[PDB]
Amino acid sequence: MVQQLSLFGSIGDDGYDLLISTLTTISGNPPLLYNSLCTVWKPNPSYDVENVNSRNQLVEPNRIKLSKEVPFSYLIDETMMDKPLNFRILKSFTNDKIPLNYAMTRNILWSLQISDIPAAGNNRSVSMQTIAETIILSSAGKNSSVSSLMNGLGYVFEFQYLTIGVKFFMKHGLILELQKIWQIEEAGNSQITSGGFLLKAYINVSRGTDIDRINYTETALMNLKKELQGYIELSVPDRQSMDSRVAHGNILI
Template sequence: MVHQLSLVSSIPHSKYLQTISSLQAITGISTPTEISTYSLITQPNLIFKPKFEPGKINQIEQYFMKCTTTWIDDEGRNLDISKPILNDSKDIIVQKLFSSDNTTNTNDNERVWTLQISDIPIAGKNQQCSQQTIFESTLVHTHIGVDSEIKNKEEVVKQETNDNKSDVMEIDEDEINKQYQNLNSTEAKIRQDSFLIYLSDLGYEVINQYWIKGKKFFIMDDIIIEIYKIFVRDDSYTGDEIKLKLLDESNTFQIKSYINIKNSTDIEQINNGIKKLINLQNLIKSLFLLEVPDRMFMDSRIKSNI
């Protein structure tokens, strides 16, 4: 768990080289760290819908979970974001992570995933920066693609199970288990090694995905500044692979400046962190304006009306 203090901004593409050069001069870092990540947004399979009653307070909260790993294919390594990405420029084609291609290449399929759930930032009219508690867990997963045939078999079992639930009051659990055991041992192994199956077993389903490419600077020991563009899947593309497009087609760069505090009750460290962010805000105000993000846009709680 970390308590994150943050400020955000954005710049047009035309100011990117100037911004990078200025940050290199301020930080003394000639080669900033590359950011190249792939993220899944997931939600619980079963959404809790409380029955609202007078005088009863709902204390149960559910959250979207973000799962992030490194974007390591050729596009992730070689994409140059210093050049504007236009509609008539070369297509950005990425590999499908969850496929059965190259399943024997363990090095390509072994991924470090960061699973993250974040609370809504602290409220208050006089907040000088966003303050948000973030819970993270990291795991190493060796992914093996799931064949469409196996997916279809699993869908059939799920559908039959749902049909049974609608027809009778009690479910024969032994019969359902037998249906799953009909998959041969190889298929079972593939199912167990799929990250999507892991998420399903954890009780989550994928609802969205995005890719980030950018650069990261470290300043004043513990302040991190990230400058990046966000890419999403282009659903109009009909090929076997995935074509990406910019989330913001104006080529705008997003900027996030933040400090991670280990303990949300360490008031002294939080106050020092806020002062450092304010000092940074004043130092680079002629370059770009760092602002407090709208806390409601950072609310990852799942509403009961979904």
């Protein structure tokens, strides 16, 4: 469980290369390639959860995220082994098509994660969100599989998507991510972040009670934002967009 303090933004791919150089001028570090695959699961509507205390609202149903890393050998087509595995490959990832299709992901079926809507009030300068996390290491039995496990808990699959981007590690534990997101269905693959990169700068705090640390984290994030003034505008997203409860449906992408 962490308090994640975050700021968001977006950029057009035209400046992409330039942006990268500037980051290396500041951090002093080179970018590192990465990828991931997230699957979202929701409580089964076939089961009537009368246990939701309607007269008191002790709790509301929520959605579970399962993440995993996928090797690049599934994301590189027959035209791309010649180039080395570095960040420049992202320049060729502008098409809505991608080597990883629905059948391979179905064949695949980790990190389990749950979150809450950010803290209310208009006196917050950065998006503060609470995250509860655990890890699944292995399994066994006659039906050892992620799908069977989540159906045993009482959850069913809803959708999935694939993230590819680069990471920058700066001082004080600040992490800056440049991402491209591909939604995947049997109908096909569609790039929601079409013609651009999604930028997200964030820090993690282990204990929410410590307030000196939280103040330091906010100071670092606002200093970073004030450093990038004039190039990219980093902003607090909409509090109602980062809500992932089942009752109301929307997805920040």
